[PDB]
Design a protein around this nucleic acid. Structure first.
Ligand SMILES: [Mg+2]
Ligand SMILES: [Mg+2]
Ligand SMILES: [Mg+2]
Ligand SMILES: [Mg+2]
Ligand SMILES: [Mg+2]
Ligand SMILES: [Mg+2]
Ligand SMILES: [Mg+2]
Ligand SMILES: [Mg+2]
Ligand SMILES: [Mg+2]
Ligand SMILES: [Mg+2]
Ligand SMILES: [Mg+2]
Ligand SMILES: [Mg+2]
Ligand SMILES: [Mg+2]
Ligand SMILES: [Zn+2]
Ligand SMILES: [Zn+2]
Lengths: 136, 116, 50, 88, 48, 179
RNA sequence: UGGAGGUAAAGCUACUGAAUGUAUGAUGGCGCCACCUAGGCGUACUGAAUACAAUUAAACUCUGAAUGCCAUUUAUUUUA
RNA sequence: CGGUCGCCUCCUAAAAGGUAACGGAGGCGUACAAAGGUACCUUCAGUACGGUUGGAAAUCGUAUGUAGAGUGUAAUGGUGUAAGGGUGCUUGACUGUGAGACAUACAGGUCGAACAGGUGAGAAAUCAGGUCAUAGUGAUCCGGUGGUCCAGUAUGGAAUGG
RNA sequence: UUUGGUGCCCAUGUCGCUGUGGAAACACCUGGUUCCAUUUCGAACCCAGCAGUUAAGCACAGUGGAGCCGAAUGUAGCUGUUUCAGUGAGAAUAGGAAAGCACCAAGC
């Protein structure tokens, strides 16, 4: 469960995911990457599910990079609570993924295994994923 | 931390800033700069940024660095200002404490009709 | 509210013409300033008046 | 069932002080008029422009106002009142 | 600066073995005060 | 001082020849010996500090100015606005008087003067000598502070390179191990 | 046409926080010794600082628009 | 039921100003006879090296460092020759005013050139009608206190008012 | 034109490195007996003189190391109407850059 050690403000305004791709747009650490095609809010739980799935289907020498990080938190008012009396308490942390940001990258294991590994990582995420390679 | 000449420039920067902020009647500004050997004098005008009158030991040809010659230098610059028909002046030092040679030059300007 | 104000009165016409502030806790000695007086039309010593 | 609701602790705000530029560039101005109200000198004073007890810029003579950018990397703003200078 | 109660007066210092009357300014008795170990009476400064 | 004239003549010739310096005043010249007798007991026993000052006066001929800390620490009982420590900086004729008096009378009286050098220069040409006890200085009567202390005599030079500063010390015959 | 501004955007070696990998690595944990105190050789590992490559922000800014706002110049229109 | 009720700072507030919610964070009901006014002088914190007590860190010297220092305070803005620090003399923390403006439903609030009187600093020019700026505050009625060139119910006082 | 002083400017003006220079001036420098001064030091401030001096500072030539500036193309955001026309950033880059504009006094 990825989580910032401390934050200055407990309850920040939500960060929009509509728009193009700001940073993390091109594979620059590995050479295959899982790009997104639909901006959405994805939480640290989905990262851990996808990262554990990919790691289980990885090998003994493969190496991985995690680009996105859940910096921003989100709140949720408790159930059966009527409107008013202030904002709710922070519940879960979500990373803002825009259309075009490379989320996961893999290297150092043959080609066939990485496509399968990226596939299982993207089936754990709500965004519509697509595979990209690193420019020579 | 520095040398005397740099400190004199720093103090000179302080005085010039104050005068340019408060001189409302636009008088000519009589800045005197004293060195170890000689002392020179020039009357600038910060509205036009030129020098109206000037005087120096080199111009007056004296073995200066003494309080005696400061009076003559002050006398020469005051004579030039009266011919120029300017008598309301502001007097600032080059950044040195107003005393000794500087005082003789300043006092010399005062007895011949200058207003400062 | 707290009352830290104090009065300064002339010592010639014994008229109170100014209102100032004073800390009795920190500064213990009575003020003996010199201010303008409307009556005497000059500067004169003003002392604290109850 | 209402289940009850908590209490908010921060709902206080102050009156908005109407700062900013008052007289625009090119505007005719008489002596004694405010040109810029600010909290801390955001625009420096120049010629024929004074200062107050609230760092408020006011004119000192008749003329046309003029803003000039100055300072390191041109990050400081300065105001002046260029007199009519009609001079026949 | 001046106008002090402690006057810096040139007092001479004698030593044993080698006289070496060194005159140095100090605020002490105005006479030939004898020092028992001077510079010249030290194994470090002279003498291997 | 007659040795001051000796300083002029001797330092000029030898230093000039040793490195072919193109000007006689390129050779280094010593400026000021700062003395810093500072003690933290003035936070509690202020009286003690006063006596300290008088001894500093009696050693140099300049009354010591008491210095104040620029911070506040609870563990040391320190607080801002207090005077803890006096510093004296001698110039002109008096500093050379103190220097010669130190090396010839006070310094060789040190209980065990084995000396220390080469490991004292700060890299900019300065030099500090850490004295252990004050009683060794002749200008002090037996009656003194209930606590005894040392000294922090330091030196400065016009040059910024340590080797030429060492050269000046050797020309001045400042008695340290190999330096 | 002139000007005020600090948003959208962008950037984080230009700060404040958050934060990924690689390399050199303070630091501790962990040992094995000697020494009871000054320490030493490797650390399954933690990770200061620096360099390279990459990130995040309503209450971050070394930058940074358009629109909008104010005024003036010219043309036209209405007696508001 | 719980919470709040006035004022000040930031964000939301969409680059003029203004803009709400039981929206998100904080403070105030002051402090200073110096932390005011003036003249003069002066400039970080930290870090590196070198040095008795003295230690990671007290003080000293040199160098480096462009603000992370200070500016009484909650934030914002400003300010590194400044508005920060020190010293000397002082009390303008004045009297009577006030053209012209900001912002405003009103009541109130904010800035202010300039004039007359008499002062303080300074050689003088100049500056001083409280502080680097914004919170530190409560109408009217009623009564009390000081002064007063006004009234004093026939007249002189007094009472009682102005 | 060159040196010295100063104002305007506020790094394409800086920090640093390597060399050259002084005729006059600028500077270090020589002393504290005078005016003046140190929260303590003639260090500084202030005096009266130029013996020595080109290390400094200062002034010139080189140095693209650090810092700074930065084109065109393209792109993100905007305005309209389109699902295309203007507006056009930030970042990155080729690269520039060893200041510039005026006044005065002296030999020129
Ligand atoms: Mg507000
Ligand atoms: Mg944005
Ligand atoms: Mg950052
Ligand atoms: Mg209730
Ligand atoms: Mg707007
Ligand atoms: Mg606005
Ligand atoms: Mg604050
Ligand atoms: Mg004062
Ligand atoms: Mg103040
Ligand atoms: Mg009642
Ligand atoms: Mg009657
Ligand atoms: Mg009656
Ligand atoms: Mg040279
Ligand atoms: Zn009176
Ligand atoms: Zn002997």
């Amino acid at each position: 469960m990825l989580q910032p050690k401390r934050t200055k403000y407990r309850k920040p305004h939500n960060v929009s995911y509509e728009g193009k791709a700001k940073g993390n747009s091109y594979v620059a650490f590995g050479e295959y990457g899982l790009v997104a095609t639909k901006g959405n809010w994805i939480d640290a739980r989905a990262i851990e599910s996808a990262r554990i799935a990919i790691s289980k289907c990885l090998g003994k020498t493969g190496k991985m990079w995690i680009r996105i990080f859940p910096h921003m938190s989100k709140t949720k008012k408790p159930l059966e609570v009527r409107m008013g009396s202030g904002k709710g308490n922070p519940e879960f942390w979500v990373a803002v993924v825009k259309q075009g940001t490379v989320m996961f990258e893999v290297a150092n294991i043959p080609e066939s295994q990485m496509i399968k590994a990226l596939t299982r990582a993207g089936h754990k995420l709500p965004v519509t994923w697509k595979i990209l390679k690193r420019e020579e | 931390m520095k040398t005397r000449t740099e400190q004199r420039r720093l103090r000179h920067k302080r005085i010039v800033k104050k005068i340019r902020a408060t001189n409302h009647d636009n008088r000519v500004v009589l800045m005197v700069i004293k060195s170890l050997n000689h002392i020179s004098v020039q009357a600038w005008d910060f509205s036009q940024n030129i020098v109206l009158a000037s005087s120096s030991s080199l111009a007056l040809k004296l073995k200066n660095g003494n309080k005696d010659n400061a009076k003559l230098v002050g006398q020469d610059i005051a004579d030039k200002l009266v011919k120029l028909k300017l008598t309301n002046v502001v007097f600032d030092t080059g950044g040195s404490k107003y005393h000794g040679r500087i005082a003789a030059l300043a006092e010399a300007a005062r007895e011949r009709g200058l207003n400062f | 509210a707290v009352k830290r104000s104090t009065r300064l009165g002339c010592n010639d016409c014994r008229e109170i013409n100014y209102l100032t502030f004073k800390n009795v806790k920190k500064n213990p000695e009575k003020l003996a300033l010199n201010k303008f007086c409307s009556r005497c039309r000059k500067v004169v010593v003003h002392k604290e008046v109850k | 069932s209402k289940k009850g609701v908590g209490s908010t602790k921060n709902g206080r705000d102050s009156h908005a002080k109407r700062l900013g530029a008052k007289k625009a560039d090119g505007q005719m101005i008489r002596t004694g008029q405010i040109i810029y109200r600010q909290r801390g000198t955001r625009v420096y004073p120049g010629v024929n422009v004074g200062l107050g007890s609230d760092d408020t810029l006011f004119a000192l003579s008749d003329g046309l106002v003029k803003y000039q950018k100055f300072g390191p990397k041109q990050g400081k703003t300065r105001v002046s009142v260029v007199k009519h200078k009609l001079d026949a | 600066k001046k106008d002090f109660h402690f006057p810096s007066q040139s007092v001479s210092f004698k030593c044993a073995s080698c006289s070496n009357s060194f005159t140095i300014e100090s605020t002490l008795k105005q006479k030939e005060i004898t020092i028992d170990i001077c510079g010249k009476c030290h194994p470090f400064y002279i003498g291997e | 001082n007659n040795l001051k004239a000796h300083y002029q003549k001797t330092i000029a010739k030898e230093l000039q020849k040793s490195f072919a310096f193109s000007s006689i005043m390129q050779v280094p010249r010593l400026e000021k010996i700062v003395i810093n007798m500072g003690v933290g007991d003035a936070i509690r026993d202020s009286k003690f500090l006063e006596s300290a000052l008088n001894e500093l006066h009696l050693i140099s001929g300049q009354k010591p100015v008491a210095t104040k800390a620029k911070n506040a620490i609870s563990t040391y009982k320190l607080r801002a606005g207090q005077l803890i420590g006096c510093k004296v900086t001698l110039r002109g004729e008096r500093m050379w008087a103190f220097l010669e008096k130190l090396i010839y009378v006070a310094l060789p009286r040190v209980r065990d003067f084995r000396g220390l050098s080469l490991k004292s220069f700060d890299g900019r040409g300065n030099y500090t000598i850490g004295i252990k006890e004050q009683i060794i200085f002749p200008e002090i009567v037996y009656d003194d502070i209930k606590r005894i202390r040392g000294f922090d005599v330091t030196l400065v030079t016009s040059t910024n390179k340590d080797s030429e500063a060492l050269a000046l010390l050797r020309a001045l015959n400042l008695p340290l191990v190999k330096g």
